[PDB]
Amino acid sequence: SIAQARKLVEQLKMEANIDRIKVSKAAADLMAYCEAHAKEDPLLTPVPASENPFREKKFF
Amino acid sequence: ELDQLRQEAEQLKNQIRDARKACADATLSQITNNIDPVGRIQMRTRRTLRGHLAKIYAMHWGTDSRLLVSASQDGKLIIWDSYTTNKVHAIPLRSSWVMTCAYAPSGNYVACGGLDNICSIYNLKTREGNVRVSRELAGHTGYLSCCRFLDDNQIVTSSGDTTCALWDIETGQQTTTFTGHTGDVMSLSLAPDTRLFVSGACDASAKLWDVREGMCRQTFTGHESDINAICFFPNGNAFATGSDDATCRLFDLRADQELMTYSHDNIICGITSVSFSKSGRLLLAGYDDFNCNVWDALKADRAGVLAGHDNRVSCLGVTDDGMAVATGSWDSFLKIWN
Amino acid sequence: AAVERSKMIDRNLREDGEKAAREVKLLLLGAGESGKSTIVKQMTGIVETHFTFKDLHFKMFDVGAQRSERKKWIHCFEGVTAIIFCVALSDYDLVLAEDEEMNRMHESMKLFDSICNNKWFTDTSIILFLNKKDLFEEKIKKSPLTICYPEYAGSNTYEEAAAYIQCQFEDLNKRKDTKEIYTHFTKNVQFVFDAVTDVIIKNNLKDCGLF
Amino acid sequence: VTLTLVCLAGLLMLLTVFGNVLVIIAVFTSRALKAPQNLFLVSLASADILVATLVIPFSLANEVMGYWYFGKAWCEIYLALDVLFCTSSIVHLCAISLDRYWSITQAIEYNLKRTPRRIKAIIITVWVISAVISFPEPRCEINDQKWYVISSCIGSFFAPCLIMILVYVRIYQIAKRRTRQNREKRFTFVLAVVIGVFVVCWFPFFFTYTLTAVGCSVPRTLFKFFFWFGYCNSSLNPVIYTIFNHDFRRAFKKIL
Numbered sequence: 079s080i081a082q083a084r085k086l087v088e089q090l091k092m093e094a095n096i097d098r099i100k101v102s103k104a105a106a107d108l109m110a111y112c113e114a115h116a117k118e119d120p121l122l123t124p125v126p127a128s129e130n131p132f133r134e135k136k137f138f
Numbered sequence: 139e140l141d142q143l144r145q146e147a148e149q150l151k152n153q154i155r156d157a158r159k160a161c162a163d164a165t166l167s168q169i170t171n172n173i174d175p176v177g178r179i180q181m182r183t184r185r186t187l188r189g190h191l192a193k194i195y196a197m198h199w200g201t202d203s204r205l206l207v208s209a210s211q212d213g214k215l216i217i218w219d220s221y222t223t224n225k226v227h228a229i230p231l232r233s234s235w236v237m238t239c240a241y242a243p244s245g246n247y248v249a250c251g252g253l254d255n256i257c258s259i260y261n262l263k264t265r266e267g268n269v270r271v272s273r274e275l276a277g278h279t280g281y282l283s284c285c286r287f288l289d290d291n292q293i294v295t296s297s298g299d300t301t302c303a304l305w306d307i308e309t310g311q312q313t314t315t316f317t318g319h320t321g322d323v324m325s326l327s328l329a330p331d332t333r334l335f336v337s338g339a340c341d342a343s344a345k346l347w348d349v350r351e352g353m354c355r356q357t358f359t360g361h362e363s364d365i366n367a368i369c370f371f372p373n374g375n376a377f378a379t380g381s382d383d384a385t386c387r388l389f390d391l392r393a394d395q396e397l398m399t400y401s402h403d404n405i406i407c408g409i410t411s412v413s414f415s416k417s418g419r420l421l422l423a424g425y426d427d428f429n430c431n432v433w434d435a436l437k438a439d440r441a442g443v444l445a446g447h448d449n450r451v452s453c454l455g456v457t458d459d460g461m462a463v464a465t466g467s468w469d470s471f472l473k474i475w476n
Numbered sequence: 477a478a479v480e481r482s483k484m485i486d487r488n489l490r491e492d493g494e495k496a497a498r499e500v501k502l503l504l505l506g507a508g509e510s511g512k513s514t515i516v517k518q519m520t521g522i523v524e525t526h527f528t529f530k531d532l533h534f535k536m537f538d539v540g541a542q543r544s545e546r547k548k549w550i551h552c553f554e555g556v557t558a559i560i561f562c563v564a565l566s567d568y569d570l571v572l573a574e575d576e577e578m579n580r581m582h583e584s585m586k587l588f589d590s591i592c593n594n595k596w597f598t599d600t601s602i603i604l605f606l607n608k609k610d611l612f613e614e615k616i617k618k619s620p621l622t623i624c625y626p627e628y629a630g631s632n633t634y635e636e637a638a639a640y641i642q643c644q645f646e647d648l649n650k651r652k653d654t655k656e657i658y659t660h661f662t663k664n665v666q667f668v669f670d671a672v673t674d675v676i677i678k679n680n681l682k683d684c685g686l687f
Numbered sequence: 688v689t690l691t692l693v694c695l696a697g698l699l700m701l702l703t704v705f706g707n708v709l710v711i712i713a714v715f716t717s718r719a720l721k722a723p724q725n726l727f728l729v730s731l732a733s734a735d736i737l738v739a740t741l742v743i744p745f746s747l748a749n750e751v752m753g754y755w756y757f758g759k760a761w762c763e764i765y766l767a768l769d770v771l772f773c774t775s776s777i778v779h780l781c782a783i784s785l786d787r788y789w790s791i792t793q794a795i796e797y798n799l800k801r802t803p804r805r806i807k808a809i810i811i812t813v814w815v816i817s818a819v820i821s822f823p824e825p826r827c828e829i830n831d832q833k834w835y836v837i838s839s840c841i842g843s844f845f846a847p848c849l850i851m852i853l854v855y856v857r858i859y860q861i862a863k864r865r866t867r868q869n870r871e872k873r874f875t876f877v878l879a880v881v882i883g884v885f886v887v888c889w890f891p892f893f894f895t896y897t898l899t900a901v902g903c904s905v906p907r908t909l910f911k912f913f914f915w916f917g918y919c920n921s922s923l924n925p926v927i928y929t930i931f932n933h934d935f936r937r938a939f940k941k942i943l
């Protein structure tokens with residue numbers, strides 16, 4: 079009854095003591111990552127049919 | 139005093155919220171406003187794997203990018219080969235009420251479990267014959283909703299007794315227990331670094347756990363109903379959830395807020411599964427309206443659709459090298475959408 | 477070879493489907509003090525029961541121990557032949573432990589509504605058992621039925637106020653044309669077999685369009 | 688009137704092909720209709736698809752051309768072929784009827800014996816029986832041997848008609864005592880159009896044909912009217928035997 083309530087306050091007291099960065103710095107890093115790696119994702123930019131194992135290639 | 143516990147808790151709740159508001163600078167609809175649209179993705183089912191004679195509840199790729207596994211109410215767990223549609227193995231399940239699968243990063247064994255309250259580990263290379271049952275992980279008091287391999291010698295599992303637990307196979311004992319949820323835990327997702335993981339519960343909240351401490355770092359709310367699915371962003375600094383509220387959302391670990399919401403006005407059913415492409419530019423989500431929409435994670439616009447199933451889509455996965463998407467459903471059919 | 481693999485294994489799946497789809501599967505429900513304990517004897521997680529009667533396979537699954545939310549696993553059980561719902565009649569003057577002022581009689585009428593009028597069991601029949609009629613008469617000759625039912629004005633007896641309770645449990649049914657409730661007073665392994673052949677007959681008779 | 692006598696028959700060919708092929712694709716493109724008893728609708732559809740494409744055209748030529756037959760050796764491969772197709776569409780209707788009679792009386796006992804091992808045995812048994820009776824200036828006249836006309840009428844209509852009325856009035860007793868759910872009118876109009884259609888289409892031909900064998904006379908105007916009634920029943924079979932089932936209607940929308 080009271081032991082749990084003591085633990086609950088302790089968890090929040092430790093959750094609200096973290097350093098946070100702004101969202102604008104947070105959205106930029108997500109956007110920058112996808113631009114750099116956009117070249118290596120076949121689904122977004124379709125791959126030549128020579129190497130697309132399920133489409134037409136060596137099934138091995 | 140009970141009031142002192144409540145008064146301290148109530149004050150800390152307001153302090154957390156205001157710190158989140160101080161971090162609000164600009165939504166993603168502004169920073170990513172002048173970005174180029176993806177366009178209109180158009181995938182087509184290359185393969186189609188037949189052989190399950192009942193619903194399909196779960197699947198999982200391999201690190202090979204060529205072998206997968208599936209589970210069904212037929213009490214059968216099949217290891218296919220996607221190139222040639224071959225059954226590499228098939229495993230008889232001691233229980234028919236499976237809800238999850240797994241595939242070791244080494245790829246020498248698989249994991250399974252269901253309403254049994256136990257998690258079975260079968261060996262995919264016995265050096266002398268077929269597959270055996272080389273472990274047993276009991277210690278949950280509710281149905282198993284999820285399990286994941288942390289390494290060749292660890293596994294982390296989720297259950298409906300409101301608890302996630304980190305085991306250490308070859309001994310069959312819980313090294314750590316992760317408590318704090320107040321509802322049935324539905325899903326978990328490891329980090330690429332394999333030092334953190336997130337979970338989703340029917341309490342309509344999610345949490346972030348440090349693996350090697352048993353500690354909970356921070357909690358995320360905002361959904362209005364049960365959370366069914368969860369997935370990390372490819373670099374491990376964000377994750378997305380899908381609820382029965384008919385909406386997906388995106389959460390940042392280092393901003394502690396909701397970033398984007400992916401919902402339309404013609405969608406009233408619940409999301410059963412989410413996943414991210416290899417680059418992280420697309421988000422794929424299965425629904426109860428028999429379909430699987432594709433979203434533009436950086437713009438929150440539909441960018442495709444995978445409509446090829448007769449019943450609701452229950453499971454969904456993507457390959458490490460990013461070549462194919464697999465979807466399963468209550469039709470007993472699983473499709474590869476290269 | 478990945479061509480002589482599937483053929484030598486898919487020949488082991490269809491060989492198991494039709495080989496294991498002939499059994500009759502059922503689903504037990506009830507409450508803690510219902511009678512689920514004292515009906516299985518006569519006939520963790522999910523429990524399974526297997527028994528035979530005149531060359532028909534029965535597979536009864538008990539889901540009592542699962543104390544998690546029900547809506548998150550009940551959809552796994554659609555497609556069973558019937559539900560088997562247990563009630564105890566000697567609980568019309570018994571109050572729950574956790575919460576007072578609520579009987580264990582009005583608490584079973586809240587689990588009959590949920591399963592009878594459900595979206596996953598819109599065409600599945602219910603087999604309702606009413607247990608502990610032995611002790612029911614003893615309590616009704618001393619403790620009047622008014623204590624539970626303030627609208628059951630009628631002479632108390634063994635089978636006058638114990639048939640007023642069937643009505644309160646069959647009125648809860650709202651699908652009065654798609655399903656039927658087969659009520660019993662626990663010939664207990666016969667009532668299920670009598671009522672199962674009547675559910676299979678009306679299924680085949682519906683493949684012909686006559687129902 | 689070559690305009691009516693060709694356009695009308697061409698309509699028969701279209702409906703028979705449209706209905707039967709649509710049934711075959713629907714059975715093979717769904718898992719709801721994956722039951723082993725639904726291979727009767729397929730085999731019956733193949734018996735009624737060959738009669739439309741092969742029997743009706745050649746027979747149509749004889750009536751409208753008026754004079755003779757182009758050939759003298761295909762008659763034994765046509766006049767016999769026609770009998771076999773007609774005989775195998777009625778004979779598949781007793782197998783459908785008998786299937787749903789054991790499912791309603793011996794329900795639990797009949798949960799087995801439903802394997803395609805038995806189903807395939809029946810269909811192979813249905814087509815061989817049809818084969819036995821089919822192949823035991825000049826024009827084409829259907830056989831007029833007194834020992835074959837009355838032998839093949841009993842073995843093709845009058846015997847299969849004695850196993851669809853006994854079955855469908857025993858099934859009338861079961862469904863009246865069993866349901867008792869105020870659904871009396873439902874299962875009496877379904878058993879009246881299954882039997883009525885089959886009898887009004889086929890009875891006059893096999894009735895007048897037998898009279899012209901014992902030594903009576905029948906007008907040739909009526910006999911040709913009755914002759915083409917049997918071809919009509921081939922088109923109607925997909926309608927009567929698949930419309931009262933909800934499962935077939937759902938699968939039909941899957942393709943249309």
Ligand SMILES: CNC[C@H](O)c1ccc(O)c(O)c1
Pocket residue numbers: 769770773774829839840843892914915917918
């Ligand atoms: C109108 N076409 C039916 C054909 O003339 C026919 C069919 C079955 C038979 O047994 C037969 O002797 C003749």
